[PDB]
Ligand binder design. Sequence first.
Ligand SMILES: O=C(c1c(F)cccc1F)N1CCCC1
Ligand SMILES: O=C(c1c(F)cccc1F)N1CCCC1
Length: 284
Amino acid sequence: PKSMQCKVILLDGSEYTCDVEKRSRGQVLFDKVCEHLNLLEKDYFGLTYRDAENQKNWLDPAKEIKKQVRSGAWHFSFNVKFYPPDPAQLSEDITRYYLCLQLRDDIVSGRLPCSFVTLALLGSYTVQSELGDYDPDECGSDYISEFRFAPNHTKELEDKVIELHKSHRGMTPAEAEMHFLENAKKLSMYGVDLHHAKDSEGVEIMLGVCASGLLIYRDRLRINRFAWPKVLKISYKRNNFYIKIRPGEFEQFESTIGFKLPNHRAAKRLWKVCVEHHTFFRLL
Ligand SMILES: O=C(c1c(F)cccc1F)N1CCCC1
Ligand SMILES: O=C(c1c(F)cccc1F)N1CCCC1
């Protein structure tokens, strides 16, 4: 039996290495990673890899790893795939913990925009969870934390983190993580996977895929929202991605909205993530 070495970037930034038989399906590797992480609530998570364009793709657990990664290194990242709309309802604290680590990267990367105050409050719960109670000995007026809190750090943000940290005395890691999640879950881009596309008139838009449905971000004025119940059908033809919407209260027939993606692969990627998210909605 010939086995390929796999390297997986974990959400703390560390690297897990293991081997799987070269014709292994993605589920085999994913099961090894989740056992390493002591993670039972595995359905919210998945593995990604980067193609020769360094675009992120979901490893399909049902298909051979080799057929997916094709010519690339067997190098993967462990990630949240389906962001729970109510993290309080997860059965395990360790699940909430990995969700926190993913959200911390969502914030630092700018995928999850956040007000100054929310950056500081989230940062304060992270510090409380990671270091425990506020200690003045480690923090002077000049203090800068090792923790990355934001896409751009300022001394003002570091000060606000410390001020809110002082208020969390006695909070345990699981409690601080639950508070982190209660705040993060409310942010407008929480759990939203964004895809570049053009509308039928060729105007640049963004399509967001999340638990609740599909978002079309046309401009700061006019964000189209299609709850899953409203989406009849989704399709991809060549580079074209089409959404069919149930008849409105004044339509007799469904409406078809068409989008142009960069290439055929980007259309197929968007279709698959939409199908997978809709099934998630169906089981909520
Ligand atoms: O076209 C759809 C679909 C969707 F993805 C969202 C809502 C309604 C639908 F018919 N599917 C194709 C594969 C299974 C789901
Ligand atoms: O069974 C699924 C699921 C999956 F296993 C693959 C793709 C889409 C899904 F909804 N889930 C249960 C809880 C979270 C997702």
